[PDB]
From a paper:
Bacterial RNA polymerase (RNAP) holoenzyme initiates transcription by recognizing the conserved –35 and –10 promoter elements that are optimally separated by a 17-bp spacer. The MerR family of transcriptional regulators activate suboptimal 19–20 bp spacer promoters in response to myriad cellular signals, ranging from heavy metals to drug-like compounds. Here we report one crystal structure of a multidrug-sensing MerR family regulator EcmrR and nine cryo-electron microscopy structures that capture the EcmrR-dependent transcription process from promoter opening to initial transcription to RNA elongation. These structures reveal that EcmrR is a dual ligand-binding factor that reshapes the suboptimal 19-bp spacer DNA to enable optimal promoter recognition, sustains promoter remodeling to stabilize initial transcribing complexes, and finally dissociates from the promoter to reverse DNA remodeling and facilitate the transition to elongation.
Although the CTDs of EcmrR (residues 112–269) and BmrR are highly divergent in sequence, their three-dimensional structures are readily superimposable. Both CTDs belong to GyrI-like domain family, a well-characterized motif that is adapted for multidrug binding. Dual site-binding is also observed in the 1.4 Å EcmrR CTD crystal structure, wherein both sites are occupied by cetyltrimethylammonium cation (CTA+), a cationic detergent in the crystallization solution. A glutamate residue in each site (E185 and E243) dictates the preference for cationic compounds, while the lack of a positive charge in the tetracyclic sterol head of CHAPSO is compensated for by hydrogen bonds between its hydroxyl groups and polar residues on the surface of site II and extensive hydrophobic interactions in the ligand-binding pocket.
Residue numbers in the entry: 112 to 269
Write the structure that this text describes.
Amino acid sequence: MLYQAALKEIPECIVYSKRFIVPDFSSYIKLIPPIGQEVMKANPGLTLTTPAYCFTLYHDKEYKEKNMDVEFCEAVNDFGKNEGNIIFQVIPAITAVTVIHKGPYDSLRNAYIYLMQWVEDNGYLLTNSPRESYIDGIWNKQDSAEWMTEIQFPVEKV
Ligand SMILES: CCCCCCCCCCCCCCCC[N+](C)(C)C
Ligand SMILES: CCCCCCCCCCCCCCCC[N+](C)(C)C
Ligand SMILES: [Cl-]
């Protein structure tokens, strides 16, 4: 796939979120559906933002694929009440270099490789946790070649 870096300012947002140490990506994503179900039950009237912004924060300090520190986030228009370890928080504004990963998730690492190289080549520094923003996927497209996930590296120019 031919990744195409873009540079953008991402404003702050309010999210509901849950943080996990996960064995691998498949194990992690099985934990995601219950989060929305439980937070919505506990906060009638909670509204997702339009457009949506639904993303994983990868909090590890190095590249990893197993035993990962991940935080699932989904943007809402206003705060609700925390439900268990599901917590509302403000995710701060960042300047990000981004690429779109088309297709299934087994090759997501290629987008991270690409962005790590771009940051080095163009005189930037990664300054906060990468975000993995889910756009199109099994919820709306059964042709997995048409899934779309945006990888966002928070950066500052050196
Ligand atoms: C000079 C710095 C060298 C590289 C810094 C990399 C920091 C790593 C950022 C957090 C870990 C990202 C893990 C993403 C895994 C995503 N997939 C499971 C989908 C592949
Ligand atoms: C029988 C085959 C079972 C397939 C299970 C499919 C479950 C799909 C549940 C999707 C949850 C996706 C969460 C990402 C949120 C989507 N938005 C980006 C639109 C907010
Ligand atoms: Cl320069």
